[PDB]
Design an enzyme around this catalytic site. Structure first.
Site, PDB file in Angstrom:
ATOM      1  N   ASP A   9     -38.714  -6.225  31.756  1.00  0.00           N
ATOM      2  CA  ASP A   9     -39.443  -5.658  30.629  1.00  0.00           C
ATOM      3  C   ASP A   9     -38.628  -5.859  29.344  1.00  0.00           C
ATOM      4  O   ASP A   9     -37.849  -6.831  29.229  1.00  0.00           O
ATOM      5  CB  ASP A   9     -39.696  -4.152  30.911  1.00  0.00           C
ATOM      6  CG  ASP A   9     -40.979  -3.633  30.295  1.00  0.00           C
ATOM      7  OD1 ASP A   9     -41.077  -3.605  29.031  1.00  0.00           O
ATOM      8  OD2 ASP A   9     -41.882  -3.217  31.077  1.00  0.00           O
ATOM      9  N   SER A  53     -49.683  -1.503  32.171  1.00  0.00           N
ATOM     10  CA  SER A  53     -48.222  -1.425  32.112  1.00  0.00           C
ATOM     11  C   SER A  53     -47.676  -0.032  32.470  1.00  0.00           C
ATOM     12  O   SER A  53     -46.531   0.093  32.941  1.00  0.00           O
ATOM     13  CB  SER A  53     -47.725  -1.768  30.712  1.00  0.00           C
ATOM     14  OG  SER A  53     -47.802  -3.173  30.493  1.00  0.00           O
ATOM     15  N   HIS A  55     -41.126  -0.018  25.222  1.00  0.00           N
ATOM     16  CA  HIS A  55     -41.974  -0.288  26.401  1.00  0.00           C
ATOM     17  C   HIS A  55     -41.188  -0.161  27.724  1.00  0.00           C
ATOM     18  O   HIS A  55     -41.599   0.565  28.618  1.00  0.00           O
ATOM     19  CB  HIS A  55     -42.558  -1.694  26.246  1.00  0.00           C
ATOM     20  CG  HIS A  55     -43.681  -2.023  27.187  1.00  0.00           C
ATOM     21  ND1 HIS A  55     -43.492  -2.771  28.326  1.00  0.00           N
ATOM     22  CD2 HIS A  55     -45.012  -1.777  27.117  1.00  0.00           C
ATOM     23  CE1 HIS A  55     -44.653  -2.953  28.935  1.00  0.00           C
ATOM     24  NE2 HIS A  55     -45.594  -2.359  28.220  1.00  0.00           N
ATOM     25  N   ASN A  98     -54.650  -5.807  30.525  1.00  0.00           N
ATOM     26  CA  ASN A  98     -55.512  -4.933  29.711  1.00  0.00           C
ATOM     27  C   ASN A  98     -56.689  -5.671  29.056  1.00  0.00           C
ATOM     28  O   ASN A  98     -57.069  -5.343  27.929  1.00  0.00           O
ATOM     29  CB  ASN A  98     -54.683  -4.255  28.616  1.00  0.00           C
ATOM     30  CG  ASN A  98     -53.474  -3.507  29.167  1.00  0.00           C
ATOM     31  OD1 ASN A  98     -52.405  -3.455  28.523  1.00  0.00           O
ATOM     32  ND2 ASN A  98     -53.613  -2.971  30.361  1.00  0.00           N
TER      33      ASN A  98
END
Ligand SMILES: [Ca+2]
Length: 278
Positions: free
Chosen positions: A39, A224, A72, A159
């Site tokens: 990530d 996520s 994130h 998404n």
């Protein structure tokens, strides 16, 4: 243990039916398991981790300091293993930074991170990939190879409100691909769907740690956010039974999952909602 007043995501996973009971029960906590967070990096010093988070490698800067400058990865990591916000409250967390301060990265760098986990994981291990892009056999191969090497991979479906099979690593055969739900058990409006999914997990308005201070939180939505709930439960199962192969972890997730709760789940989607207990 029983955690009162948990955030909604983790509240949902330890029960079959709504309404939420304001309790997150645990029988395991991810002891002896390592969760690799591929990530934007992880704020290792966040209060959520209590020392359990460290850097693996940074493929953006090319060094060993995988701290987060986006947020994130810290949020994703807290959902897996945070004291307050996390599924597996004693898991080891390793940051593998493949996404930059703006949350972007190259296919090459993501593959480098996957390979890094494959080559460096020791003991029961899970890897989370809350990221995705256009279909890439190169990316899929790296995931499938790391899984064949004994590391359970858990990835966001995406998404795009579309068939998840159009995206990598979402479509990768041996990835556990995770769609997103809301607090009323609807498929989140943005969640990808279809036969490349393995399971659904809470992904809309998920609260977790954030990178701006050691006490910072953020509430955000995405597949996520759904992915790390599943990665965290894999870690629970591997604490319970450290002898499970990735394929056996996948099967256990599926056999333990709550059936037939997700509304608007879409044709071809498995109607399985993440369940954390044995
Ligand atoms: Ca609950």
């Amino acid at each position: 243990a029983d955690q009162p007043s948990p955030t909604w995501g983790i509240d949902r996973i330890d029960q079959r039916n709504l309404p939420l009971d304001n309790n997150y029960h645990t029988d395991y906590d991810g002891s002896g398991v390592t969760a690799f967070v591929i990530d934007t990096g992880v704020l290792n010093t966040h209060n959520e981790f209590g020392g359990r988070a460290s850097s693996g490698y940074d493929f953006i800067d090319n060094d060993y300091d995988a701290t987060d400058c986006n947020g994130h990865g810290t949020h994703v990591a807290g959902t897996i293993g945070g004291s307050t916000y996390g599924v597996a409250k004693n898991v080891n967390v390793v940051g593998v930074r493949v996404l930059n301060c703006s949350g972007s990265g190259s296919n090459s760098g993501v593959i480098a991170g996957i390979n890094w986990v494959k080559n460096n994981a020791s003991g029961p291990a899970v890897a989370n990939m809350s990221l995705g892009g256009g279909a890439s056999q190169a990316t899929d191969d790296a995931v499938n190879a790391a899984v064949a090497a004994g590391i359970t991979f858990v990835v966001a479906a995406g998404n795009d409100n579309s068939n998840a099979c159009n995206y990598s690593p979402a479509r990768a055969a041996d990835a556990i691909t995770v769609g997103s739900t809301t607090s009323n058990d609807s498929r989140s409006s943005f969640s990808n769907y279809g036969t490349c999914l393995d399971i659904y997990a809470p992904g809309s308005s998920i609260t977790s740690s954030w990178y701006t201070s050691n006490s910072a939180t953020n509430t955000i939505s995405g597949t996520s956010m759904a992915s790390p709930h599943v990665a965290g439960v894999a870690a629970l199962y591997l604490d319970e039974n450290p002898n499970l192969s990735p394929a056996q972890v996948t099967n256990l997730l599926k056999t333990r999952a709550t059936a037939d709760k997700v509304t608007d789940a879409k044709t071809g989607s498995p109607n399985k909602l993440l369940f954390s207990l044995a």
